[PDB]
Amino acid sequence: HMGVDTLPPPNYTVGFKDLNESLNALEDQDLDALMADLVAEEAKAKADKIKLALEKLKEAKVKKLVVKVHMDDSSTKSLMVDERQLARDVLDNLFEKTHCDCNVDWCLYEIYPELQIERVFEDHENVVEVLSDWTRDTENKVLFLEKEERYAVFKNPQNFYLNAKNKEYLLEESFCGTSIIVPELEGALYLKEDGKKSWKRRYFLLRASGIYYVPKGKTKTSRDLACFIQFENVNIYYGIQCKMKYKAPTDHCFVLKHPQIQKESQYIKYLCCDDARTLSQWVMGIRIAKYGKTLYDNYQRAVARA
Numbered sequence: 001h002m003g004v005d006t007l008p009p010p011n012y013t014v015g016f017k018d019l020n021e022s023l024n025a026l027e028d029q030d031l032d033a034l035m036a037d038l039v040a041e042e043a044k045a046k047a048d049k050i051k052l053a054l055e056k057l058k059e060a061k062v063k064k065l066v067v068k069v070h071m072d073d074s075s076t077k078s079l080m081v082d083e084r085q086l087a088r089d090v091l092d093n094l095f096e097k098t099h100c101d102c103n104v105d106w107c108l109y110e111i112y113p114e115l116q117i118e119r120v121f122e123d124h125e126n127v128v129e130v131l132s133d134w135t136r137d138t139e140n141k142v143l144f145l146e147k148e149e150r151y152a153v154f155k156n157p158q159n160f161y162l163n164a165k166n167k168e169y170l171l172e173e174s175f176c177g178t179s180i181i182v183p184e185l186e187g188a189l190y191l192k193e194d195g196k197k198s199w200k201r202r203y204f205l206l207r208a209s210g211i212y213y214v215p216k217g218k219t220k221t222s223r224d225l226a227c228f229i230q231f232e233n234v235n236i237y238y239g240i241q242c243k244m245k246y247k248a249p250t251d252h253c254f255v256l257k258h259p260q261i262q263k264e265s266q267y268i269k270y271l272c273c274d275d276a277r278t279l280s281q282w283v284m285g286i287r288i289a290k291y292g293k294t295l296y297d298n299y300q301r302a303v304a305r306a
Contacts, residue, residue: 003210003227006234006258006267014131015068015141016078022066023052025078027097031055034064034080065128069094069108070143077144083128087121088301094144095305104302105146113139115264116245117237117255120150122291123298133259140262153183153284154299160185160284175296182208185285186221187278190249192270197247199272204228206285208292211256229269231290235259236283239270248272252279254286 016022026034035051038058064082067090071077077097081090087108095102108121110130121130134140153160157170160183174181185206190199205212205221210230214221239253252273261268273279288295 001227003229003233004269006229006256006269007260008267011065011132011134011136013066014134014138015076016066019056019066020052022068022078023055025066025068026080027078030078030080063128065131067127067131067142070141071098072145081127083126085127086123087125087127088123088298090127091123092305098144102305103146104151104299104306105148106144107147107150109143109145109147111141111143112237112262113141115255115257115262115268116240117257118240119235119237120147122287122295123301124291124294130259133262135262138262149280149284151299151302152280153288154296160281160288171296175293180208180288180292182206182289183281183285185281188274189278189282190272192242192246192248192272194266199247199249204271206282206289208289210289211286229256231286233258234269236286236290238279238283242270242272246270250274252276254279254283 013019013022016025023031031048031051034055038055062082062084064080067079067081069077069079069090077094079090079093090108091106094100095106100106107123108127109118110121111118121127131142154171157167157174161170161174161181162184183206186204188201188203191202192199202213203221205225209227209232211228212225213228215226218224234256235258237255237257239248239255241251242248242253243251248270249272252275254271254273256269256271258267271282273282291298
């Protein structure tokens with residue numbers, strides 16, 4: 001019932017040289033906002049140099065991180081992020097700084113350059129929590145960009161649960177109820193074998209708790225199917241260049257990985273779809289499954305800011 005293991009059996013700045021460079025990278029109002037919290041022309045260059053040193057003598061309390069966020073146009077922004085802040089808050093901060101259009105597609109996006117995987121942050125996720133799993137010498141980056149797939153189901157619920165008013169009923173039925181209705185989603189995918197550049201086609205089914213399969217005949221798709229993986233154990237990511245790197249049949253790949261793992265590992269599960277549409281279906285479906293009603297709330301909170 002538990003399925004495959006996603007783990008083997010039983011930092012203060014991210015994107016900067018040291019705590020100094022990160023604080024030197026803060027905007028004016030932000031540096032002053034930190035000073036306000038921390039306590040309880042040539043003169044500017046020296047006064048803000050002392051604010052730095054004063055601030056650098058400030059530990060305990062609500063723990064803080066300075067996070068470099070990478071923008072569309074290759075610029076960056078350094079944000080103060082304490083451990084109570086969700087992606088929703090960091091987003092709200094980025095909407096103020098950038099004066100963007102505040103559409104629902106804007107999101108934080110993590111990239112793992114070594115593992116070549118990437119995913120949206122969900123808006124309810126604790127930013128510090130996510131970044132804590134990263135190593136000291138990490139290549140990982142946080143991006144601010146538009147991903148119009150992130151709330152696909154809420155814009156077009158008919159495209160996943162296989163008119164303005166009917167969409168409403170579908171979502172209310174699917175989300176605004178006693179329990180979440182996960183899309184009826186089943187099909188063949190290619191599962192990468194542990195530690196090998198080889199892939200096997202298996203028939204898989206989406207359930208609220210995880211991905212399930214038909215073991216070996218066992219009455220085909222009956223109701224005594226086995227558990228491949230539970231969603232509580234993993235985040236879902238896009239896999240990049242799985243074709244070239246692992247001989248994946250296609251480049252339409254998702255990756256299921258425990259947050260903690262930061263290196264090539266056989267506990268990381270790679271799945272390959274036949275086309276881009278099947279990938280889209282599975283990613284949205286697994287996200288609906290894992291996050292349920294929270295995802296719907298995330299959507300509603302975003303539409304309010306639009």
